[PDB]
Symmetry: C5
């Protein structure tokens, strides 16, 4: 089968629509999401036209083998979607209404700068390659774009699923390509990060600060070194959940900055001890009293500055 | 092949049944289960009718290619089931009795609020899409709904496998869809959580409390900081087995609360030492004696409050 | 093609045989094993009969598409086996001798009660579903049941591969099913568990007991708390290799019991210190001397009781 | 179908081109990358010749089954690419213009010597095997070689995608093979390695050096042994992200060298203590003062020497 | 199609050859390797004979569907290879020259006794099953056995790829089977094990021995218990890279033996302290001085004995 012939010099408009049935998974490290949805396609093939009077049937159902169908592909996939055709219905003027249910693993990059208080725009880019007989342009049938009520992405809140209705038409290997942008806007459920990472990480930091009410070097060294090791365990945990970014993430900046606080607390504990040993406990007492205020104050101000820079 | 024609204006009733052969797996993190079962379908196709006298045969066996079969799909799947047809038997009036054995990975969300003392209702939603020639409705043949006695889901107890017999009929892309709800009710085998997570986590908490019968700051700091680090190891272990929920789970609440107990025990140990150093051991002795009772009492009362809130 | 017709009212006997080519893998957590074997089937189809004189050929080779073949399936699989037919040979009386080489991932449950000194009976349940024209019964051709000499399951010793020659005949969805039980008896190579888990776990326990020859509370607290943390690391390691069971395993019971020994050792260390501080070192000396004998004696007796209960 | 016949004794030139649509993944441990691209092929088959007068059509579209297509394979793959033909267009003279969209997992080795400041040349080697009727040579159509602007490899910067235009023609099993070298030059985004591994690893090393301002053996032993254990945690983390190389990597050399610094710091701490105990604190004081300068100086010089050797 | 008929009572000789294109991966835990290679087959089918004079063509190319091809399978696989036929060329006498490119995951057991200084013989066992019409024997065409120069197995050195030219002919289910043994001899690149596991493990052992130049029980307990915990971390790391063997490996023996050294060092530290406390420092001083020499001497002699036993 060949594509539909033009009346004038007009391109063939393939109207499209995506209705999500299942999203469910998103892999932050791989920057992929798994989607299962309907892909509806519609175009006019005058060669398939008929009259209700003489034909009897008001609509004709066809097998994909029997008629011409445009080759629609997703841009941002590593493996092409697994499609199963559901229905092909031809109307009197030859308007074909195609429907398939697909499953794909879509490669859409994430911006982790504000992680875990980040929002993302996930994309599904539909594309059609023009043939020598006719140029094929894609369109959006907004009534056939949407999502099922039960669509819930684990660890995320789905805000919208829309389409940039004007295609990106361009040349690629001396043939026109018509690209459409379907956008799934999501925002992270940051909740669990608070009792599991943020508050435990702060509690161990505040425990290292009890060294400012202790004259015992041996105990101080245990407090600051023990909690530093628990901090490294949270840093390793956090960095396993995320990919390696050429920029700093919000959590990454706090995790990094908290090392400097442990480092400076080791210096304070060292200084305090050296002075007691040098028979200067009055000088040591002054530094320790200042540290009791300076460490929480600088921690609160430094975190205000970070939240300002990131949000 | 086209669908069966109606006598009046009646829809085609496709009677369904699911008989589980294997369940075996459930992934809490992914919120999926793997199922292997029989899917029996039955409908009337008058075009396939015959008489026992003239035909000889009392039933006719058909290949799926030879006759019309309704396109039945599962709603809550990422990838469509792998089906193998077992038998297609046509009776005199044209009653088709279809049987397939399928395997699918079903996306069914879990409520972890009471974890690991949680029960779940897993679902398999069957769906049929109506054609232009006829509207297709799904039904439940309760005699063909069940499970094999050897069906055992690892780490769970299967309570029941039933079907919500009245379908959810609705419009989707200007065509009727007939959805059925098959429900597998399960309850978690909470047993192993007790000797592996709950009791080890309590033993290390009770070891931190021996600091209330010690005047040795260095030893106290080791007791409370060491056991806090073993608590973090159990918190990380627990959170790897579960997905990130926008609500608190039962185990998550206990795990979180136990951090506050370690934190307050570090404050007690600090206060006690500061006082001995300030030559106030009588005041420190009073706080330490109160702590011996206050810590277990508040721990028991706080756990009673939690169990009340969650169950 | 239809099934072979009966002479009288006799069912069709499909003789079966499984010859293992590769086993190699068993996953304790998933409770699955991967098998690659020959599946030989044999039945009489009189419609395929011929005479050696007039036909010339003493045996006729057929493609599976050309003749009737019984639909044989495995019960305990999530996904059906991948089969490749090797040969189909028809003898003069119409005796069909079918041979395929398959690969399957079989769901067979394990009893971890005596882990890692456990033995298991793995099963492959063959099943045939009777047709309306004839009832199909399965049989065992013991000469066609066996295993290749090179068949070795990693981490296990294969003891036998036999078949329960009498099928379990029963009704399922108003049709007879004929089930056969192929049993692969295996016993775990418990060796590596000794230098990798058992002896390291005992060495750290015996190191905690050196606290009974020490008056130093600070050192004692380090000995018992440090080794408890290494015990938790072994408990986590062990529980990652096994699934969550609604019963206690042998290793699990020892691992759990050893926590009680650490807990009681923390109590002894606490009591001993409290007494030295209260100026009662003579009383503390008595408890410490008793502990030196009591801890190893109760440990040896408690382990004798466990080994009795489990074996 | 047989291959096109020659006019003279000329080989068939199959012009090739690869246009990358998605790269996205690279696995350092496996030394693989996942690619999704267009593979365009072009050759002359005079047997397929026609012209618009007599045929009507100016170009003829063909199914791959209908015409001869050269068997083009990738050399460096474990599993052959998943190809989907997009278009086959036959011109006047019989010039076939083939286009497929493939997905492959390509095995291309990496040189980790300068890790994580390393650059790599990834390869896709195309190959064609000559037939007895005709020798087949591969060529590069540079206008059909390139990459999409949105092509971004996670954790890397893509520098170029070119082709070594002259094929490597050679004999293999008494038949000519024509190999082409497509090269994807990439450089690692080393950024994240700094706040996540390099700076944390240096902070813990500098904390071990506070032992040079402490006379407390107990505290010193805790400082150096605790931080050594956090160093081992970073060494294990680093070695899990990389494969086992028969050469030293840059990060591996620093990680290894830092062990010698911990070892020598344990010797210093031991020596210092032994002397204080032997009533030689003046000698110990001299060694400790020298160490305060020697450790950072030798660390800075040793790192200059390493950076010199590796870059 | 039927197999070629014999002249006398001679079996059909199927000449074979394997030319490796990619090896690349080997999984020690699974005891598998992934291979991609050419499989060339050659046999005489007199029914396919022709004369160059009358036929014109000097060689005839055939599709696999058109002629008889022997069913060749690999013995040691879980899943059968993915093959793609490259060429089938028939010579005048009817000599068929078949060529396919396959990909397989081969199950070949490894001997870890000398790990990581081990060498292995990996096998690919080809097999053919004789038919009733003719007995089929396999042979080796040594000119068609080899490997590509770019074939490099990550973490290993390939020493040779040869074939045991005489097949293992045997009966299996009353039919002859002809098995060939292709052997890939490899030796491990042990290099990385030295800076990553061996030297770090020795450095922490030598750090525990600094306790023989310390009178400080508290410090000694920290030195030996801390380093024991880092030893357990290396033991767990090593045992995750290897499968559970019913024999001791070289690394496993050293790792195990080093626990006894830690255990005895804890006894020494305990004895030394007990004596100082009992006012016997002269006796304790003697044991500590002996230990300084005894521990390294016994460690060096015990390692010489092990290297002797294993190599
Ligand atoms: C160490 C200290 C940790 C502090 C965490 C700060 C979180 C924050 O500041 O998070 C930022 C988000 C804001 O979300 P947004 O929509 O991206 O704001 C974008 C604003 N624009 C569009 C104007 C740029 O605030 C929250 O959701 C507040 C609730 C989480 C608080 C958890 C605290 C424990
Ligand atoms: C730290 C302290 C940990 C305490 C654990 C409390 C467990 C609990 O309270 O578990 C709750 C479950 C109840 O199961 P339910 O059916 O969901 O009750 C629902 C009740 N409604 C329907 C009325 C709302 O009790 C058990 O199975 C008790 C056995 C487990 C005890 C293990 C203790 C160790
Ligand atoms: C902490 C202490 C750990 C002690 C380990 C006890 C092992 C045991 O008792 O193991 C039990 C197995 C017995 O094997 P069985 O065939 O199942 O006996 C079934 C008997 N019936 C049929 C009569 C019920 O003994 C062995 O193989 C002994 C060798 C392993 C010893 C390793 C010790 C280190
Ligand atoms: C412990 C101390 C760690 C020091 C890290 C040194 C990094 C280095 O020296 O990195 C080397 C790279 C150079 O990149 P190149 O293109 O490969 O140079 C090749 C030069 N030829 C072609 C002449 C041979 O420098 C950088 O990108 C500098 C930025 C990273 C600095 C991070 C420091 C923290
Ligand atoms: C703790 C102490 C660890 C000591 C490690 C000993 C290594 C050894 O002895 O390794 C053994 C291999 C020998 O290789 P082979 O070919 O198998 O010898 C087989 C000999 N036959 C055929 C005669 C039986 O020696 C090497 O490659 C030496 C280089 C590695 C040294 C790394 C030391 C650090
Ligand atoms: Cl390929
Ligand atoms: Cl095979
Ligand atoms: Cl024999
Ligand atoms: Cl034979
Ligand atoms: Na300490």
């Amino acid at each position: 089968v060949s594509p539909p012939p033009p009346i004038a010099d007009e391109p063939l408009t393939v109207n499209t629509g995506i209705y999500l049935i299942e999203c469910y998974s998103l892999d932050d490290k791989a920057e992929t999401f798994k989607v299962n949805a309907f892909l509806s396609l519609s175009w006019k093939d005058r060669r398939l036209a008929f009259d209700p009077v003489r034909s009897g049937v008001r609509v004709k159902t066809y097998e994909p083998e029997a008629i011409w169908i445009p080759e629609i592909r997703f841009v941002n996939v590593q493996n092409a979607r697994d499609a199963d055709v559901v229905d092909i219905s031809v109307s009197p003027d030859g308007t074909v209404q195609y429907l398939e249910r697909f499953s794909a693993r879509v490669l859409s990059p994430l911006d982790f700068r504000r992680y875990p208080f980040d929002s993302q725009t996930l994309h599904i880019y539909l594309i059609v390659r023009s043939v020598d007989t006719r140029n094929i342009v894609l369109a959006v049938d907004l009534e056939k774009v949407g999502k099922n009520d039960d669509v819930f992405l684990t660890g995320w809140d789905i805000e919208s699923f829309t389409a940039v209705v004007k295609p990106a038409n361009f040349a690629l290997e001396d043939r026109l390509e018509s690209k459409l942008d379907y956008q799934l806007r999501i925002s992270r459920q940051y909740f669990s990060y608070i009792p599991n990472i943020i508050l435990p990480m702060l509690f161990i930091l505040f425990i290292s600060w009890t060294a400012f009410w202790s004259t015992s070097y041996e105990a101080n060294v245990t407090l600051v070194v023990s909690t530093l090791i628990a901090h490294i365990a949270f840093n390793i945990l956090v960095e396993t959940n995320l990919p390696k970014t050429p920029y700093m993430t919000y959590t990454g900046a706090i995790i990094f900055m908290i090392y400097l606080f442990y480092f400076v607390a080791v210096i304070e504990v060292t200084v305090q001890h050296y002075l007691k040993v040098e028979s200067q406990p009055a000088r040591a007492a002054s530094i320790t009293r200042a540290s009791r205020i300076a460490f929480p104050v600088v921690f609160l101000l430094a975190n205000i500055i970070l939240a300002f820079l990131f949000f």
